[PDB]
Amino acid sequence: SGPPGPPGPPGPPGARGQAGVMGFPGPPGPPGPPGKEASEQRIRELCGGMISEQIAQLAAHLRKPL
Amino acid sequence: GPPGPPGPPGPPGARGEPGNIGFPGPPGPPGPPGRAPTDQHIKQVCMRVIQEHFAEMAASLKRP
Amino acid sequence: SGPPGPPGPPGPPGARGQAGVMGFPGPPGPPGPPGRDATDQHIVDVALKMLQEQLAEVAVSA
């Protein structure tokens, strides 16, 4: 002579979902800048004497007498 | 006769959903600069130009 | 009285669990490609000019 007791209390909340996966890599960076050009003055300083010697040697050669 | 005791607690709920994907990463850094000419390279190009126009130099330097 | 009743039925299941945490931030992208090298043309430009100048200077002495 006993009635079954009431249903029990609500169970515990479920386990947390698994952590999300890492995001995709970002896009490639931009192209680097183009290479810097030597100044006219730098080129003139580096090549002035060379051009002069060559012209000198050639003028001399073309005036030779045999 | 007295009533029985309340039942046991219910089962643990359902495991939640997976979390979302993380943010995308930042853009990479810029590439390295192009190379500038070295002094020696500059000299080498000038000598090439001289040789490539030697003919024009001779025609200009020709005597009567 | 008499005998007590059996234990009642189980309770209902608890709520669903919270959703997982958001993932880690993605890594930086890779470096961009290198910039283009300075071409030789800007050197040729000046060499040709110098060559012209000095040929003229020479010719001037007539």
Residue numbers in the entry:
A (entry chain C): 2 to 67
B (entry chain A): 3 to 66
C (entry chain B): 2 to 63
The article reads:
All five constructs were screened for crystallization, but only three of them yielded crystals of sufficient quality, crystal structures for 111, 211 and 121 were independently solved using the MAD phasing from selenomethionine derivatives (thereafter designated as 111sm, 211sm and 121sm) to 2.25 Å, 2.10 Å and 1.6 Å, respectively. Whereas the crystal packing for 111sm and 211sm are similar (two trimers per asymmetric unit), it differs from that for 121nat or 121sm (one trimer per asymmetric unit). Namely, a triple helical chain linked to chain B of the NC2 domain is always in the leading position, the one linked to A is in the middle, and the third one linked to C is in the trailing position. We suggest here to use a rule of BAC-translation: chain B is leading, A is middle, C is trailing. This way, construct 121 (or α1Aα2Bα1 C) translates into staggering order of α2α1α1, whereas 211 translates into α1α2α1. Despite the variations of composition (homo-trimeric for 111) and stagger (121 or 211) that might not represent a native stagger, the regions of sequences derived from type I collagen are well structured. Crystal structures of 111, 121 and 211 constructs demonstrated that a staggering order can be manipulated at least for short native collagenous sequences, meaning that such sequences are rather adaptive to various abnormal conformations.
Two host-guest collagen peptides (GPP)4-(GXY)4-(GPP)3, where (GXY)4 sequences are from the α1 and α2 chains of human type I collagen, were recombinantly linked to chains A, B and C (corresponding to α1, α2 and α3 in collagen nomenclature and omitted here to avoid confusion) of the NC2 domain in the following combinations designated as α1Aα1Bα1C (for short 111), α1Aα1Bα2C (112), α1Aα2Bα1C (121), α2Aα1Bα1C (211) and α2Aα2Bα2C (222). Three unique chains form a parallel α-helical right-handed bundle. The most important observation is that the triple-helical chain stagger is entirely determined by the NC2 domain.
